[PDB]
Design an enzyme around this catalytic site. Structure first.
Site, PDB file in Angstrom:
ATOM      1  N   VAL A  80       5.472  -5.580 -16.514  1.00 20.64           N
ATOM      2  CA  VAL A  80       4.887  -6.112 -15.289  1.00 20.64           C
ATOM      3  C   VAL A  80       3.376  -6.102 -15.442  1.00 20.64           C
ATOM      4  O   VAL A  80       2.786  -5.053 -15.721  1.00 20.64           O
ATOM      5  CB  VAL A  80       5.303  -5.296 -14.048  1.00 20.64           C
ATOM      6  CG1 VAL A  80       4.751  -5.931 -12.788  1.00 20.64           C
ATOM      7  CG2 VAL A  80       6.813  -5.171 -13.967  1.00 20.64           C
ATOM      8  N   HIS A  85       0.800  -1.216   0.000  1.00 18.68           N
ATOM      9  CA  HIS A  85       0.000   0.000   0.000  1.00 18.68           C
ATOM     10  C   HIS A  85       0.837   1.271   0.000  1.00 18.68           C
ATOM     11  O   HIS A  85       0.284   2.355  -0.207  1.00 18.68           O
ATOM     12  CB  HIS A  85      -0.940   0.016   1.209  1.00 18.68           C
ATOM     13  CG  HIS A  85      -2.066  -0.963   1.119  1.00 18.68           C
ATOM     14  ND1 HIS A  85      -2.760  -1.200  -0.048  1.00 18.68           N
ATOM     15  CD2 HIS A  85      -2.623  -1.768   2.055  1.00 18.68           C
ATOM     16  CE1 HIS A  85      -3.693  -2.107   0.173  1.00 18.68           C
ATOM     17  NE2 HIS A  85      -3.631  -2.468   1.441  1.00 18.68           N
TER      18      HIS A  85
HETATM   19  O1  LIG Z   1      -4.279  -5.163   5.262  1.00 13.37           O
HETATM   20  C1  LIG Z   1      -4.045  -4.104   4.692  1.00 13.37           C
HETATM   21  C2  LIG Z   1      -4.171  -2.770   5.386  1.00 13.37           C
HETATM   22  C3  LIG Z   1      -5.596  -2.464   5.917  1.00 13.37           C
HETATM   23  C4  LIG Z   1      -5.602  -0.996   6.377  1.00 13.37           C
HETATM   24  C5  LIG Z   1      -6.999  -0.584   6.878  1.00 13.37           C
HETATM   25  C6  LIG Z   1      -6.940   0.897   7.296  1.00 13.37           C
HETATM   26  C7  LIG Z   1      -8.126   1.281   8.198  1.00 13.37           C
HETATM   27  C8  LIG Z   1      -7.934   0.822   9.625  1.00 13.37           C
HETATM   28  O2  LIG Z   1      -8.562  -0.155   9.989  1.00 13.37           O
HETATM   29  N1  LIG Z   1      -7.083   1.519  10.443  1.00 13.37           N
HETATM   30  C9  LIG Z   1      -6.793   1.325  11.819  1.00 13.37           C
HETATM   31  C10 LIG Z   1      -7.567   0.521  12.669  1.00 13.37           C
HETATM   32  C11 LIG Z   1      -7.274   0.447  14.031  1.00 13.37           C
HETATM   33  C12 LIG Z   1      -6.211   1.175  14.563  1.00 13.37           C
HETATM   34  C13 LIG Z   1      -5.450   1.995  13.733  1.00 13.37           C
HETATM   35  C14 LIG Z   1      -5.758   2.088  12.380  1.00 13.37           C
HETATM   36  N2  LIG Z   1      -3.649  -4.131   3.405  1.00 13.37           N
HETATM   37  O3  LIG Z   1      -3.508  -5.358   2.735  1.00 13.37           O
HETATM   38 CA   LIG Z   2       1.282  -3.286 -15.874  1.00 15.51          CA
HETATM   39 ZN   LIG Z   3      -5.112  -6.597   3.257  1.00 14.45          ZN
END
Ligand SMILES: O=C(CCCCCCC(=O)Nc1ccccc1)NO
Ligand SMILES: [Ca+2]
Ligand SMILES: [Zn+2]
Ligand SMILES: [Ca+2]
Ligand SMILES: [Zn+2]
Ligand SMILES: [Zn+2]
EC number: 3.5.1.98
Lengths: 368, 536, 126
Positions: free
Chosen positions: A187, A135
């Site tokens: 890619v 991400h």
């Molecule tokens: O797994 C992931 C990342 C998921 C990110 C979700 C962001 C929102 C969130 O739940 N934030 C959060 C929750 C609790 C405490 C701090 C931040 N990508 O693959």
């Molecule tokens: Ca591509």
């Molecule tokens: Zn995820």
């Protein structure tokens, strides 16, 4: 047949603390390693200590300013970087904790060393469960990720391989990796993810690339409660078609475990066997493969899933009974390797999947 | 000519609205102004006439900053792209530089509270509680090991060199943070003084820090043993309930879904849909049934009949004569209708009450079959897993709980029937019944959660099926017509007896002219019985 | 509501010495019914989404390509004309709206539209 799989593990990765109540916990990797030790899987595998990645190996994709900020910020000087902290999206969702730069260095170095090993043809399989942060952007942090090591590993792979195929089975859309290679044909990124009022809010069916990279990025959006049968029915044919049209030279497989049932943040209904079916299908094609970690926020299920995929990649069969280990009590009350799904409704009806699969097939037929 | 008028007539008839028709007219007018080509015209008219091949063929004969995707935006051309020092040739030629994709959402976070039963929240909380303690403990233990290693190294060299030994901010470890974090946690505000002592004079300062860390490790380990004791029997109380996502919804949804009005609406809506399709004239044959259900086992049939008889025999308000009458209805007439006493069909004309009874009986039989199939699958999977795990060399290919024996696995289903009987009698509490079902059948147990009420419902229908002269007249008319063989028979002889069958339907119309009339076909095929119901 | 978090954080603490197309309330298919434009089925099989420009109901799966999630805002059914206008994405919505309203005052025009249809219909141009 039986081949060689390089394994990358650093003993210090489990100690890095994201903060209290934060869903992201590096501790999972530690437990995974512990399970690998108690199934006797260290004998058939080669274990390495990943070298730390210098800022010079990170600035191949990230800006020098963002990396300098990451190397400079500490919990005791948050007051002197507030503006910068607002600029680079370091804050609530992606906090600044003690030794975050070292965490990024280890996670990036594992995958970069695996990519270098695969380039040198000293193995055709490298595993790094500390990696898989997809991400992160060029000059910002997003989705609990600070440095995009998948992009760096692919950039390292591109020095010897003309075409590199990236597959993402994390429940979220891998927007960082797809955006990094959106306008290139060297890619192709396949992503299977949930779509609709969900992080990161990207990865539509019509996001197929731009410019020279058109038709080189495929997204499968899904609904709540997909299960093993549907995932197996739509993963194998799509990947077979992708491999027959694209004909890649190396594969990078993101094995994020937040798509399993019972996840703290996920919505899917997969199990460990159904999750690792994708690893078996990918391994069938006999290509240099780099397996990475990723998401997963129910810690015990992450340990189970990743130890099972590590066993599968070794062509080793392990008993369903969990051996005694340091984190045994996490796995109660059953103490089994495999998990059971829930009875949540599968909102992905057969006609929806057939239509999306047909659209993807027609998009794939247009490659040259 | 008149052909164009007929075409327009059928299209505005089939569109069933004026607004959609006027949109079609706007399309054809925009074509008429020479802004639309023929192929583009047909690709625009395809949404309107994509489901009428005849109409589409007739229309074809009559004819004879930038943005891409949905979530990517173009970066400004006059935008100072952040410089990078490591960009090699592949970096320049491969990496994307012009589009930036903006997240198309704002909702901060909701996790999956939508589908996270309160029992999955307790498990999550217990996990995070375990993780905090474990991470602190393992940081302390790693620091202990690092200090033990540096002390062992120190003890092996010359005494005149020991005072010359020093430590950096990594404190002998491979990390510049973790050891200091552990020392900070142990010592509070006095951490910097201890850290300076360790860096400057390791020989005298290492053993005391090691002793303190070891004492804290032992105390934390015993506290963790107590906490482990407490954390158990919370996983036990939460696990099986966390995987069952439907029980709370299912109980109320099923207690409503079985009312007579709901069953009537489920077929009235289908009848209305088919009537609207006939009005629009779409290509659908006027002989298909509105609802179709399958019975796949006779053993399930006698099991359901035994359950209903068991409940009805213990009724205080049903008299012995009525008990006998219900026995004849349930164990004699119904199997005769299903032909328990290919291409052999039976025809039945029924009022509302018989339709309700047939719906409820089919529901019960389907649920019994589902439970039976689940038990068979569980037994097969257990046997296969035992056979597989017996033959395992494990890593040579280069407490707990005692699972039930096979006998209990094959006796689950009769035990389930006994449990249903006990619940119907009222000897077992609903809570214990539900818990035993959940522990027996895991996530498929909810299918049997509201069985007794279902049985109760069926019983009422049966009772009314004796007290209303319409119902007995219906069954007598069926018997009298079957004595002639017109109602039901061989599939081929249908056209031989079809007119006679018509007479039967006629009589039905003159016996329930104020009530809904239902045509029910029982078709036998390959050991299954398909019940097709259509509303007249 | 006894959680162990407080005891653990105290035990580890540092020594700091410093409308109509929906099911009824009880749950029932409303009668008379309105059906999907593609399958002619009511809300019983699946929830229906209503186009806010024309009275055409649709199923999330009956579309092409199917919608993955519920549309939160105003949704446009695939049976309108503004899609071909959307081919050119440079112009804003005000010009598009004025172009549409150029034909919003004589909405019937039935004689003139059939007349234009036959006028174009002639195989040999005049
Ligand atoms: O797994 C992931 C990342 C998921 C990110 C979700 C962001 C929102 C969130 O739940 N934030 C959060 C929750 C609790 C405490 C701090 C931040 N990508 O693959
Ligand atoms: Ca591509
Ligand atoms: Zn995820
Ligand atoms: Ca994904
Ligand atoms: Zn529809
Ligand atoms: Zn519309």
């Amino acid at each position: 047949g039986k081949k060689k799989v390089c394994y990358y593990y650093d003993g210090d990765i489990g100690n890095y603390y994201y903060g209290q109540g934060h869903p992201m916990k590096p501790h999972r990797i530690r437990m995974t390693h512990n399970l690998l030790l108690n199934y006797g899987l260290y004998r058939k595998m080669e274990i390495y200590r990943p070298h730390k990645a210098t800022a010079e190996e990170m600035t191949k994709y990230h800006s020098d300013e963002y990396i300098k900020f990451l190397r400079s910020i500490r919990p005791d000087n948050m007051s002197e970087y507030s503006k910068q902290m607002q600029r680079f999206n370091v804050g609530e969702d992606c906090p600044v904790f003690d030794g975050l730069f070292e965490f990024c260095q280890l996670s990036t170095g594992g995958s970069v060393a695996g990519a270098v090993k695969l380039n040198r043809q000293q193995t055709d399989m490298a595993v790094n469960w500390a990696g898989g942060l997809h991400h992160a952007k060029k000059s910002e942090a997003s989705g609990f990720c600070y440095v995009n090591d998948i992009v760096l590993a692919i950039l390292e792979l591109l020095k010897y391989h003309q075409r590199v195929l990236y597959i993402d089975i994390d429940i979220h859309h891998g927007d960082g990796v797809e955006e990094a290679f959106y306008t290139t044909d060297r890619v192709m990124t396949v992503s299977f993810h949930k779509y609709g009022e969900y992080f990161p809010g990207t990865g539509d069916l019509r996001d197929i690339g731009a410019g020279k990279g058109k038709y080189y990025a495929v997204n499968f959006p899904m609904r709540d409660g997909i299960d093993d049968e549907s995932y197996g029915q739509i993963f194998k044919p799509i990947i077979s078609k992708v491999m027959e049209m694209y004909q890649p030279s190396a594969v990078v497989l993101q094995c994020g475990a937040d798509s399993l049932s019972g996840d703290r943040l996920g919505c899917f209904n997969l199990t460990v066997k159904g999750h690792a079916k994708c690893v078996e299908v990918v391994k069938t094609f006999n290509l240099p493969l780099l397996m990475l970690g990723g998401g997963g926020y129910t810690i015990r299920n992450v340990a189970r899933c990743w130890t099972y995929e590590t066993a599968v990649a070794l062509d080793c069969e392990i008993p369903n009974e969990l051996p005694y280990n340091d984190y045994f009590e996490y796995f109660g009350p059953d103490f089994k390797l495999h998990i059971s799904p829930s009875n949540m409704t599968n909102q992905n009806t057969p006609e929806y999947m057939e239509k999306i699969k047909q659209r993807l097939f027609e998009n794939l037929r247009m490659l040259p | 000519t008149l052909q164009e008028f007929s075409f327009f007539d059928k299209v505005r008839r089939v569109l069933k609205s004026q607004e959609v028709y006027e949109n079609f007219l706007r399309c054809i007018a925009l074509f008429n102004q020479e802004l639309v080509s023929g192929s583009e015209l047909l690709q625009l008219v395809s949404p309107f006439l994509g489901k009428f091949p005849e109409l589409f063929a007739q229309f074809k004969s009559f004819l004879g900053c930038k943005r891409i995707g949905s979530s990517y935006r173009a970066l400004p051309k006059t935008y100072q792209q952040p410089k990078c020092s490591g960009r090699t040739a592949i970096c320049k030629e491969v990496l994307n530089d012009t589009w930036v994709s903006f997240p198309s959402w704002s909702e901060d976070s909701t996790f999956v509270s939508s589908k996270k039963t309160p029992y999955e929240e307790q498990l999550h909380r217990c996990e995070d509680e375990r993780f905090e303690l474990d991470v602190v403990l393992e940081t302390n233990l790693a620091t202990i090991r690092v200090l033990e290693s540096v002390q062992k190294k120190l003890s092996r060299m010359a005494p005149e060199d020991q005072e010359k030994f020093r430590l950096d901010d990594s404190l002998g470890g491979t990390s510049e943070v973790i050891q200091r974090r552990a020392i900070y946690r142990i010592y509070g505000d006095k951490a910097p003084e201890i850290i300076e002592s360790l860096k400057k004079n390791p020989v005298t300062a290492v053993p005391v820090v090691l002793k303190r860390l070891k004492a804290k490790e032992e105390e934390w380990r015993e506290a963790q043993q107590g906490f482990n004791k407490i954390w158990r029997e919370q996983y036990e109380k939460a696990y099986l309930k966390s995987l069952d996502h439907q029980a709370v919804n299912f109980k109320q949804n099923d207690t409503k879904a079985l009312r007579s009005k709901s069953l009537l609406n489920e077929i009235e809506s289908v009848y209305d849909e088919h009537q609207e399709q006939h009005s629009e004239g779409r290509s659908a044959p006027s002989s298909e049934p509105h609802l179709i259900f399958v019975y796949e086992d006779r053993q399930i049939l006698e099991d359901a009949a035994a359950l209903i008889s068991y409940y009805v025999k213990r009724q205080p308000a049903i008299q012995k004569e009525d008990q006998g009458t219900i026995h004849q209805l349930l164990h004699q007439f119904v199997p005769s209708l299903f032909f328990s006493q290919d291409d052999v069909y039976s025809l039945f004309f029924a009022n509302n009450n018989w339709y309700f009874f047939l719906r409820l009986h089919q529901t019960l039989c389907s649920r019994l079959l589902k439970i039976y199939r689940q038990a068979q699958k569980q037994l097969l999977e257990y046997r296969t897993e035992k056979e597989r795990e017996k033959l395992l060399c494990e890593g040579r290919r280069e407490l707990r709980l005692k699972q039930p024996s096979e006998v209990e696995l094959e006796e689950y289903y009769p035990a389930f029937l006994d449990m249903v009987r006990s619940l119907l009698e009222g000897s077992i509490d609903p809570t214990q019944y539900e818990d035993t079902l959940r522990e027996m059948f895991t996530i498929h147990a909810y299918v049997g959660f509201t069985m007794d009420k279902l049985v109760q419902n069926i019983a009422r229908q049966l009772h009314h099926l004796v007290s209303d002269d319409v119902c007995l007249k219906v069954v007598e008319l069926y018997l009298n017509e079957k004595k002639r063989g017109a109602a039901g028979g061989n599939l081929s002889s249908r056209c031989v007896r079809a007119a006679r069958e018509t007479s039967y339907q006629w009589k039905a119309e003159r016996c329930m002219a104020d009530e809904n009339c239902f045509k029910v076909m029982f078709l036998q095929r390959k050991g299954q019985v398909i019940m097709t119901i259509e509303l007249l | 509501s006894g959680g162990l978090m407080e005891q653990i954080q105290a035990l580890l603490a540092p020594p700091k010495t410093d409308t109509q197309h929906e099911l009824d309330h009880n749950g029932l298919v409303p009668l008379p019914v309105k059906v999907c434009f593609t399958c002619n089925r009511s809300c019983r099989v699946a929830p229906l989404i209503q186009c806010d420009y024309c009275p055409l109901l649709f199923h999330m799966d009956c579309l092409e390509p199917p919608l993955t999630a519920m549309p939160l805002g105003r949704w446009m059914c695939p049976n309108h004309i503004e899609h071909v206008v959307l081919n050119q994405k440079n112009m804003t919505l005000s010009n598009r709206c004025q172009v549409f309203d150029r034909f919003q005052d004589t909405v019937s025009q039935h004689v003139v539209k059939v007349d234009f249809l036959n006028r174009i219909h002639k195989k040999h141009p005049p």
